[PDB]
mmCIF file of all heavy atoms in Angstrom:
data_model
loop_
_atom_site.group_PDB
_atom_site.id
_atom_site.type_symbol
_atom_site.label_atom_id
_atom_site.label_comp_id
_atom_site.label_asym_id
_atom_site.label_seq_id
_atom_site.Cartn_x
_atom_site.Cartn_y
_atom_site.Cartn_z
ATOM 1 N N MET A 386 3.192 23.672 27.264
ATOM 2 C CA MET A 386 2.287 23.255 26.197
ATOM 3 C C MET A 386 0.865 23.646 26.568
ATOM 4 O O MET A 386 0.155 22.901 27.245
ATOM 5 C CB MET A 386 2.390 21.756 25.950
ATOM 6 C CG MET A 386 3.705 21.308 25.373
ATOM 7 S SD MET A 386 3.777 19.537 25.109
ATOM 8 C CE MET A 386 5.457 19.397 24.537
ATOM 9 N N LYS A 387 0.443 24.829 26.123
ATOM 10 C CA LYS A 387 -0.911 25.285 26.406
ATOM 11 C C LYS A 387 -1.935 24.560 25.542
ATOM 12 O O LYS A 387 -2.991 24.147 26.032
ATOM 13 C CB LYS A 387 -1.003 26.790 26.186
ATOM 14 C CG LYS A 387 -0.080 27.621 27.060
ATOM 15 C CD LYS A 387 -0.501 27.635 28.524
ATOM 16 C CE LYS A 387 0.207 26.561 29.337
ATOM 17 N NZ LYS A 387 -0.128 26.652 30.786
ATOM 18 N N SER A 388 -1.639 24.390 24.257
ATOM 19 C CA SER A 388 -2.602 23.802 23.338
ATOM 20 C C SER A 388 -2.813 22.329 23.645
ATOM 21 O O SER A 388 -1.859 21.572 23.825
ATOM 22 C CB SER A 388 -2.130 23.966 21.898
ATOM 23 O OG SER A 388 -2.969 23.252 21.010
ATOM 24 N N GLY A 389 -4.078 21.922 23.679
ATOM 25 C CA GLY A 389 -4.420 20.567 24.055
ATOM 26 C C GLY A 389 -4.266 19.537 22.971
ATOM 27 O O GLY A 389 -4.355 18.342 23.263
ATOM 28 N N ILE A 390 -4.038 19.961 21.730
ATOM 29 C CA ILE A 390 -3.773 19.036 20.646
ATOM 30 C C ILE A 390 -2.289 18.941 20.320
ATOM 31 O O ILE A 390 -1.865 17.955 19.706
ATOM 32 C CB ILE A 390 -4.586 19.410 19.392
ATOM 33 C CG1 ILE A 390 -4.240 20.812 18.917
ATOM 34 C CG2 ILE A 390 -6.063 19.303 19.680
ATOM 35 C CD1 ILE A 390 -5.029 21.223 17.736
ATOM 36 N N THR A 391 -1.487 19.930 20.710
ATOM 37 C CA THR A 391 -0.043 19.746 20.696
ATOM 38 C C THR A 391 0.371 18.690 21.707
ATOM 39 O O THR A 391 1.264 17.879 21.443
ATOM 40 C CB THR A 391 0.654 21.069 20.987
ATOM 41 O OG1 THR A 391 0.332 22.016 19.964
ATOM 42 C CG2 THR A 391 2.148 20.877 21.034
ATOM 43 N N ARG A 392 -0.271 18.687 22.873
ATOM 44 C CA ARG A 392 0.010 17.673 23.877
ATOM 45 C C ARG A 392 -0.417 16.291 23.408
ATOM 46 O O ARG A 392 0.104 15.283 23.895
ATOM 47 C CB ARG A 392 -0.688 18.041 25.182
ATOM 48 C CG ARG A 392 -0.347 19.432 25.668
ATOM 49 C CD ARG A 392 -0.547 19.576 27.154
ATOM 50 N NE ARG A 392 -1.928 19.322 27.530
ATOM 51 C CZ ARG A 392 -2.888 20.234 27.499
ATOM 52 N NH1 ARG A 392 -2.635 21.468 27.106
ATOM 53 N NH2 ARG A 392 -4.111 19.903 27.858
ATOM 54 N N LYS A 393 -1.359 16.223 22.471
ATOM 55 C CA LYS A 393 -1.748 14.934 21.915
ATOM 56 C C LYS A 393 -0.689 14.410 20.958
ATOM 57 O O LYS A 393 -0.405 13.207 20.936
ATOM 58 C CB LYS A 393 -3.093 15.060 21.211
ATOM 59 C CG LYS A 393 -4.255 15.231 22.163
ATOM 60 C CD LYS A 393 -5.630 15.307 21.486
ATOM 61 C CE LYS A 393 -5.789 14.393 20.280
ATOM 62 N NZ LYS A 393 -5.901 12.971 20.686
ATOM 63 N N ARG A 394 -0.099 15.296 20.156
ATOM 64 C CA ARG A 394 1.005 14.892 19.295
ATOM 65 C C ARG A 394 2.188 14.403 20.117
ATOM 66 O O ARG A 394 2.819 13.396 19.775
ATOM 67 C CB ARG A 394 1.422 16.059 18.408
ATOM 68 C CG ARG A 394 0.354 16.514 17.462
ATOM 69 C CD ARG A 394 0.937 17.302 16.317
ATOM 70 N NE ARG A 394 2.073 18.110 16.734
ATOM 71 C CZ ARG A 394 3.067 18.475 15.936
ATOM 72 N NH1 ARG A 394 3.072 18.110 14.663
ATOM 73 N NH2 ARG A 394 4.057 19.213 16.412
ATOM 74 N N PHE A 395 2.504 15.103 21.206
ATOM 75 C CA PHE A 395 3.609 14.688 22.059
ATOM 76 C C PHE A 395 3.394 13.279 22.588
ATOM 77 O O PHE A 395 4.315 12.456 22.577
ATOM 78 C CB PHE A 395 3.768 15.674 23.211
ATOM 79 C CG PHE A 395 5.009 15.471 24.019
ATOM 80 C CD1 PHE A 395 6.211 15.999 23.607
ATOM 81 C CD2 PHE A 395 4.972 14.753 25.194
ATOM 82 C CE1 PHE A 395 7.344 15.818 24.345
ATOM 83 C CE2 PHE A 395 6.108 14.567 25.936
ATOM 84 C CZ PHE A 395 7.296 15.101 25.510
ATOM 85 N N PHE A 396 2.184 12.981 23.051
ATOM 86 C CA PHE A 396 1.909 11.650 23.564
ATOM 87 C C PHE A 396 1.873 10.623 22.446
ATOM 88 O O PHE A 396 2.135 9.440 22.684
ATOM 89 C CB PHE A 396 0.600 11.650 24.341
ATOM 90 C CG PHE A 396 0.767 11.960 25.794
ATOM 91 C CD1 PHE A 396 0.783 13.265 26.235
ATOM 92 C CD2 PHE A 396 0.914 10.948 26.720
ATOM 93 C CE1 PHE A 396 0.939 13.555 27.562
ATOM 94 C CE2 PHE A 396 1.070 11.239 28.055
ATOM 95 C CZ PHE A 396 1.082 12.546 28.473
ATOM 96 N N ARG A 397 1.550 11.050 21.226
ATOM 97 C CA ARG A 397 1.715 10.173 20.074
ATOM 98 C C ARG A 397 3.183 9.830 19.872
ATOM 99 O O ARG A 397 3.534 8.682 19.578
ATOM 100 C CB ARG A 397 1.143 10.840 18.825
ATOM 101 C CG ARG A 397 0.429 9.889 17.891
ATOM 102 C CD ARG A 397 -0.410 10.633 16.879
ATOM 103 N NE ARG A 397 0.365 11.603 16.119
ATOM 104 C CZ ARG A 397 -0.144 12.380 15.174
ATOM 105 N NH1 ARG A 397 -1.427 12.305 14.872
ATOM 106 N NH2 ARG A 397 0.630 13.233 14.533
ATOM 107 N N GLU A 398 4.057 10.822 20.022
ATOM 108 C CA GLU A 398 5.486 10.575 19.907
ATOM 109 C C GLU A 398 5.981 9.681 21.033
ATOM 110 O O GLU A 398 6.715 8.716 20.794
ATOM 111 C CB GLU A 398 6.239 11.898 19.919
ATOM 112 C CG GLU A 398 5.970 12.772 18.722
ATOM 113 C CD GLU A 398 6.116 12.041 17.412
ATOM 114 O OE1 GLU A 398 7.149 11.365 17.221
ATOM 115 O OE2 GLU A 398 5.201 12.142 16.568
ATOM 116 N N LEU A 399 5.595 9.990 22.267
ATOM 117 C CA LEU A 399 6.084 9.229 23.408
ATOM 118 C C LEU A 399 5.617 7.784 23.344
ATOM 119 O O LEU A 399 6.355 6.869 23.724
ATOM 120 C CB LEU A 399 5.626 9.891 24.704
ATOM 121 C CG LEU A 399 6.557 9.779 25.904
ATOM 122 C CD1 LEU A 399 7.934 10.314 25.590
ATOM 123 C CD2 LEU A 399 5.956 10.520 27.066
ATOM 124 N N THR A 400 4.400 7.559 22.855
ATOM 125 C CA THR A 400 3.911 6.200 22.675
ATOM 126 C C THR A 400 4.839 5.396 21.777
ATOM 127 O O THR A 400 5.140 4.232 22.062
ATOM 128 C CB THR A 400 2.504 6.242 22.088
ATOM 129 O OG1 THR A 400 1.606 6.836 23.034
ATOM 130 C CG2 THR A 400 2.029 4.856 21.698
ATOM 131 N N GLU A 401 5.302 6.002 20.687
ATOM 132 C CA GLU A 401 6.194 5.312 19.764
ATOM 133 C C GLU A 401 7.521 4.969 20.433
ATOM 134 O O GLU A 401 8.058 3.873 20.248
ATOM 135 C CB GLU A 401 6.384 6.176 18.513
ATOM 136 C CG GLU A 401 7.683 6.002 17.757
ATOM 137 C CD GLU A 401 7.762 4.663 17.024
ATOM 138 O OE1 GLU A 401 6.728 3.956 16.961
ATOM 139 O OE2 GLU A 401 8.851 4.329 16.501
ATOM 140 N N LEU A 402 8.063 5.897 21.221
ATOM 141 C CA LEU A 402 9.312 5.630 21.928
ATOM 142 C C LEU A 402 9.158 4.490 22.922
ATOM 143 O O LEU A 402 10.025 3.615 23.010
ATOM 144 C CB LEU A 402 9.771 6.889 22.640
ATOM 145 C CG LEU A 402 11.210 6.961 23.097
ATOM 146 C CD1 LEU A 402 12.126 7.114 21.927
ATOM 147 C CD2 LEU A 402 11.314 8.132 24.012
ATOM 148 N N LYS A 403 8.064 4.483 23.676
ATOM 149 C CA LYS A 403 7.875 3.458 24.693
ATOM 150 C C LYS A 403 7.793 2.072 24.075
ATOM 151 O O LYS A 403 8.337 1.108 24.624
ATOM 152 C CB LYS A 403 6.617 3.754 25.498
ATOM 153 C CG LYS A 403 6.721 4.979 26.367
ATOM 154 C CD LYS A 403 5.475 5.181 27.187
ATOM 155 C CE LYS A 403 5.386 6.588 27.703
ATOM 156 N NZ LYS A 403 4.047 6.916 28.228
ATOM 157 N N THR A 404 7.105 1.945 22.944
ATOM 158 C CA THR A 404 7.042 0.667 22.255
ATOM 159 C C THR A 404 8.403 0.239 21.729
ATOM 160 O O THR A 404 8.599 -0.943 21.433
ATOM 161 C CB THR A 404 6.042 0.744 21.104
ATOM 162 O OG1 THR A 404 4.811 1.300 21.575
ATOM 163 C CG2 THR A 404 5.779 -0.630 20.531
ATOM 164 N N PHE A 405 9.342 1.173 21.613
ATOM 165 C CA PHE A 405 10.686 0.903 21.127
ATOM 166 C C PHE A 405 11.724 0.893 22.240
ATOM 167 O O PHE A 405 12.842 0.420 22.021
ATOM 168 C CB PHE A 405 11.049 1.947 20.065
ATOM 169 C CG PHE A 405 12.516 2.201 19.918
ATOM 170 C CD1 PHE A 405 13.286 1.413 19.095
ATOM 171 C CD2 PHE A 405 13.117 3.253 20.578
ATOM 172 C CE1 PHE A 405 14.628 1.652 18.949
ATOM 173 C CE2 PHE A 405 14.462 3.495 20.434
ATOM 174 C CZ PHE A 405 15.216 2.695 19.618
ATOM 175 N N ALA A 406 11.369 1.368 23.430
ATOM 176 C CA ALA A 406 12.307 1.470 24.532
ATOM 177 C C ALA A 406 12.847 0.095 24.919
ATOM 178 O O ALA A 406 12.406 -0.947 24.427
ATOM 179 C CB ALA A 406 11.643 2.134 25.734
ATOM 180 N N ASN A 407 13.818 0.111 25.829
ATOM 181 C CA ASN A 407 14.596 -1.067 26.210
ATOM 182 C C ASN A 407 14.615 -1.154 27.732
ATOM 183 O O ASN A 407 15.448 -0.520 28.385
ATOM 184 C CB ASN A 407 16.002 -0.967 25.634
ATOM 185 C CG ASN A 407 16.840 -2.186 25.910
ATOM 186 O OD1 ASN A 407 16.398 -3.307 25.707
ATOM 187 N ND2 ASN A 407 18.062 -1.972 26.370
ATOM 188 N N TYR A 408 13.703 -1.935 28.294
ATOM 189 C CA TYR A 408 13.561 -2.046 29.745
ATOM 190 C C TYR A 408 14.317 -3.260 30.280
ATOM 191 O O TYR A 408 13.736 -4.245 30.728
ATOM 192 C CB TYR A 408 12.088 -2.110 30.128
ATOM 193 C CG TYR A 408 11.233 -1.059 29.481
ATOM 194 C CD1 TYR A 408 10.337 -1.387 28.487
ATOM 195 C CD2 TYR A 408 11.315 0.261 29.874
ATOM 196 C CE1 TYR A 408 9.556 -0.433 27.898
ATOM 197 C CE2 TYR A 408 10.534 1.224 29.285
ATOM 198 C CZ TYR A 408 9.656 0.868 28.300
ATOM 199 O OH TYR A 408 8.870 1.818 27.704
ATOM 200 N N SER A 409 15.644 -3.168 30.233
ATOM 201 C CA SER A 409 16.502 -4.167 30.857
ATOM 202 C C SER A 409 16.938 -3.738 32.249
ATOM 203 O O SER A 409 16.991 -4.563 33.166
ATOM 204 C CB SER A 409 17.732 -4.422 29.991
ATOM 205 O OG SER A 409 18.775 -3.520 30.316
#
Side-chain angles (χ1 to χ4, degrees):
Chain A
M386 293 180 183
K387 300 289 94 175
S388 173
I390 60 182
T391 298
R392 306 204 300 275
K393 288 182 37 73
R394 297 200 325 153
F395 190 83
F396 270 86
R397 218 165 55 180
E398 294 310 311
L399 212 56
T400 295
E401 153 71 10
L402 197 71
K403 292 183 198 166
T404 310
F405 154 86
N407 184 48
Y408 312 108
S409 88

